[PDB]
Design a protein around this ligand. Structure first.
Ligand SMILES: COC(=O)N[C@H](C(=O)NN(Cc1ccccc1)C[C@@](O)(Cc1ccccc1)C(=O)N[C@H]1c2ccccc2C[C@H]1O)C(C)C
Lengths: 99, 99
């Protein structure tokens, strides 16, 4: 669909059988979700935001459904204020910015 | 124009007679720019992101040009790692997310 920006672009996502709300963020290189349990081994990663850096857990090849669209990619988990969908997954569902 | 997300969505902006590079961020409520001088009175404010909060100076009624389009709005100035155009200005140029 076409999403306007008068309010935060929040959509519902499905991961691990659970529904969660997440923000579509074109300014984020990666996707990071609030603390939760995911399968497999994880690797360490550092990501920087406006207030500094934070350590997160990187999980690969995770299935995640965004507004009915299925994507399979890298997902980070850590102390984030809100669940964030970044460019790595936005390109998989074919999302573009238009004006 | 239509902008793909394989790379960071950076564009050229004009403000205060100066040309700068900025990131179109749908995950940002406000617009924040690296330290610079702007006319008018300002108010202190605290904004939060990944990593924590930072203090910035808030300027109201500022004019900016984004890829030829003119927009008016509140602009925050502070120690941000990169110039960010947020929803408060993206709406004024008719920017939308599509997939
Ligand atoms: C390369 O690193 C990266 O891509 N990091 C990414 C990142 O920090 N992304 N954004 C852009 C960014 C920031 C710093 C450096 C580069 C790029 C910022 C963000 O949208 C995320 C965010 C954070 C908390 C809540 C909601 C959204 C944000 O900070 N939003 C806040 C903001 C920004 C400006 C003015 C006001 C406000 C309030 C709030 O909306 C992470 C991997 C997610």
């Amino acid at each position: 669909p076409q999403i306007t920006l008068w309010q935060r672009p929040l959509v519902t996502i499905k991961i691990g059988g659970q529904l969660k709300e997440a923000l579509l963020d074109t300014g984020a290189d990666d996707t990071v979700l609030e603390e939760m349990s995911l399968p497999g081994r994880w690797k360490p990663k550092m990501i920087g935001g406006i207030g500094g850096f934070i350590k997160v857990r990187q999980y690969d090849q995770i299935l995640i459904e965004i507004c009915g669209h299925k994507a399979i990619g890298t997902v980070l988990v850590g102390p984030t204020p809100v669940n964030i969908i970044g460019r790595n997954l936005l390109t998989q569902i074919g999302c573009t910015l238009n004006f």
